Amino acid sequence: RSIASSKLWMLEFSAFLERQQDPDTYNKHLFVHISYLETVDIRQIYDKFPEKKGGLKELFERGPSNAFFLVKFWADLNTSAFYGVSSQYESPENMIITCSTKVCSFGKQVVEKVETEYARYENGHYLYRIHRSPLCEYMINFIHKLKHLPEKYMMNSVLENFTILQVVTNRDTQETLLCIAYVFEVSASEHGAQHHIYRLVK
Amino acid sequence: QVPMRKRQLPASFWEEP
């Protein structure tokens, strides 16, 4: 139904551009946004993500398999400036979790960010949150470069070798709680950001 | 490089909502 394993549920995800007009006025543009699931054979995407060491094939083999999703974004790129990322997770357990985000060009890791997040109790469950985390410089320049390509065919061709892997882990037990693979296209002119969510299998 | 559209993916993969 949703991006949820037995132990973690992603409630919200977004990457955005924020501009301050005056001290009382803000404008925000969402590049991508998440607030029955077809499946995708994980062997079809192995080469788009790093392997060898902490690889995507090794991660899935160790499982659990109900924690591996693929998100396909049609990103809206139609736009001093703050570039950020926000996410929110729910769990029925109070744990200390770790989020590893790896940006890859051509299946080769290029940026890595690790973050630790703690729970807040709310109405019987536990919330984890990344708020207005600064988008790193590689991504900001990549977006600027994308917007400078001559046509959407060149942007989407470039984006075919751009992926992000997110692994969320229980810091104590090292259990994989959520693993999300992200593939991207540019949304078509006045379509706005859209996505499909898949379960990864086999 | 094997193009993504020649790989076996659900048809939805290229159908933007």
Write out the two tokens for A10: 């992603």
Distance from CA of B17 to the nearest CA of A (A): 6
Say how far apart CA A56 and CA A153 lie, in whole Å.
28
Say how far apart CA A106 and CA A109 lie, in whole Å.
8
Say how far apart CA A165 and CA A50 lie, in whole Å.
9
- The whole domain housing A67 covers 1-202
Q: What is the CATH number of the domain that holds A35?
A: 2.70.50.80
> Looking at the 3D structure of chain A, how many domains does it have?
1
Q: Are the Cβ atoms of B16 and A188 closer than 8 angstroms?
A: yes
Say how far apart CA A104 and CA A190 lie, in whole Å.
28
How many angstroms separate the Cα of B11 from the Cα of each of A86, A115, A165, A181? 30, 35, 23, 18
CB atoms within 10 A of CB A10: 23
* A88 three-state secondary structure: strand
Asked if A75 and A189 touch (Cβ cutoff 8 Å), the reply is no
Question: Reported resolution in A?
Answer: 2.6
- Interface size A-B, in CB pairs within 8 Å, comes to 26
Q: Are the Cβ atoms of A198 and B8 closer than 8 angstroms?
A: no
